[PDB]
Ligand binder design. Structure first.
Ligand SMILES: [Zn+2]
Length: 331
């Protein structure tokens, strides 16, 4: 069995190897990459997403979200308070202001320390789930707007034509911008490209140990667990690496820098934070190996994980018994 310790693996494809997305994902798995639940892919030196990032200031963040925490430093939830619209230009200026700018620090480990010590006492603001792409139309390899669709994958494997179409999303982040512990909708894969700016630190639990994380979360968020059998679908809960370690939860961490891809794997619980102003793009995708994960994915029916019409068909076909209950949760 490849990668038995479930380490996060890092890949350096050549130009040739970067020419077939599906084929390279299969190759990573053949090396045991998926056991970690996350991998890093460094593109070939000659590759670029786009020419420059000089004309992105006019993109609109219709609904910036201020992330307000409740709890204690290492075990907290956050909620999203809606702010007034701002351009990326305005957002960037805000990220860089005294109130929100990255503090001076020694290195990534020093910033991580400061994040977990201090995050709860501040409320950073971010631009989430903005439909769009910063990949140049002419970029042919690993263009996140040019991947095969989950709908076509599902139809190829199962022979059922379904409505829906998934497209990439943009994220604009600042120091302390926080991604709560979660797996992807329907436990899909995800791919995340960091277009520009400061790093993102990721935490990941191996898919084979996902239930250990769920068990701990039930204990640490007892009221949340009571209200919903799949409350991590709400994407509001944070647990520090110190608390994970204290409770024996297997996990790994890695820092993504601008110009790097990260792929998350079916049922890989992940969380993280932004080091400072950045912009990332992400999309879900599927392979034949995802199908069985999609069939077993936990669903929120309490109304607190509203997703989209796009997920309707996946629940409808892969989980007929859960569909009705899920649906009315969506109503
Ligand atoms: Zn719920």
């Amino acid at each position: 069995a490849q990668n038995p310790n479930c380490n996060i693996m890092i890949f350096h494809p050549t130009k040739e190897e970067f020419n077939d997305f599906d084929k390279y994902i299969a190759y990573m798995e053949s090396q045991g990459a998926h056991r970690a639940g996350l991998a890093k892919i460094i593109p070939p030196k000659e590759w670029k997403a786009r020419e420059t990032y000089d004309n992105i200031s006019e993109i609109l963040i219709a609904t910036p979200l201020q992330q307000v925490a409740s709890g204690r430093a290492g075990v907290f939830t956050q909620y999203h308070k809606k702010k007034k619209a701002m351009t990326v230009g305005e957002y960037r200026h805000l990220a860089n202001s005294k109130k929100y700018q990255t503090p001076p620090h020694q290195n990534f480990e020093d910033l991580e320390r400061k994040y977990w010590k201090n995050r709860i006492y501040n409320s950073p603001i971010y631009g989430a789930d903005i439909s769009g792409s910063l990949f140049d139309e002419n970029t042919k390899q690993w263009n996140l707007g040019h991947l095969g669709t989950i709908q076509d994958l599902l139809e190829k494997e199962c022979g059922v034509v379904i409505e829906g179409v998934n497209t990439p999303y943009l994220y604009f982040g600042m120091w302390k911008t926080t991604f709560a512990w979660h797996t992807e909708d329907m436990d899909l894969y995800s791919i995340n490209y960091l277009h520009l700016g400061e790093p993102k630190t990721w935490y990941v639990v191996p898919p084979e140990h996902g239930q250990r994380l769920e068990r701990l979360a039930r204990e640490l968020f007892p009221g949340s667990s009571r209200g919903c059998g799949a409350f991590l679908r709400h994407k509001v809960a944070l647990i520090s690496p110190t608390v994970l370690k204290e409770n024996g939860i297997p996990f790994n961490r890695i820092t993504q820098e601008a110009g790097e891809f990260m792929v998350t794997f079916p049922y890989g619980y992940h969380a993280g934070f932004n080091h400072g102003f950045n912009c990332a793009e992400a999309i879900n995708f599927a392979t034949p190996r995802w199908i069985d994960y999609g069939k077993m994915a936990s669903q929120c029916s309490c109304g607190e994980a509203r997703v989209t019409f796009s997920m309707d068909a996946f629940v409808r076909i892969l989980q007929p018994e859960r569909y009705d209950l899920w649906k009315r949760g969506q109503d």
